[PDB]
Amino acid sequence: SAPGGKSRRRRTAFTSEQLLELEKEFHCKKYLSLTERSQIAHALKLSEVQVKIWFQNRRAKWKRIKAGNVS
DNA sequence: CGACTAATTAGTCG
DNA sequence: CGACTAATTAGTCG
Question: Which nucleotides of C are covered by protein (CB under 7 A)?
Fold first, then answer.
């Protein structure tokens, strides 16, 4: 077991096992509390940071619309 | 002290 | 060469 590739793949690497519980909340609520976000990533082999980008990228698109305009 | 948000950044796609 | 998406990352409240 040794590393090979080292690049920031812009597309969260999700797996079927992970998607099973990940999609669960997506079909439940679009807002996760402290005792929610920090729990899903603790239930299995995950990290709170990874579960954050998932939501960030979704809101990032909204920040491009809900802002100030010019001219 | 850590998570959450959001901006910076990085990199492949167009 | 541009653009957009996303990990990176730091600030601030919990």
Answer: 5-9, 14
How long is the CA A39 to C1' B11 vector, in angstroms?
32
Domain range for A49 is: 1-71
Query: Where residue A58 sits, what CATH number does that domain have?
Result: 1.10.10.60
The structural domain count of chain A equals 1
CA of A9 to C1' of B11 (A): 8
DSSP state string for A21-58: HHHHHHTT-S---HHHHHHHHHHTT--HHHHHHHHHHH
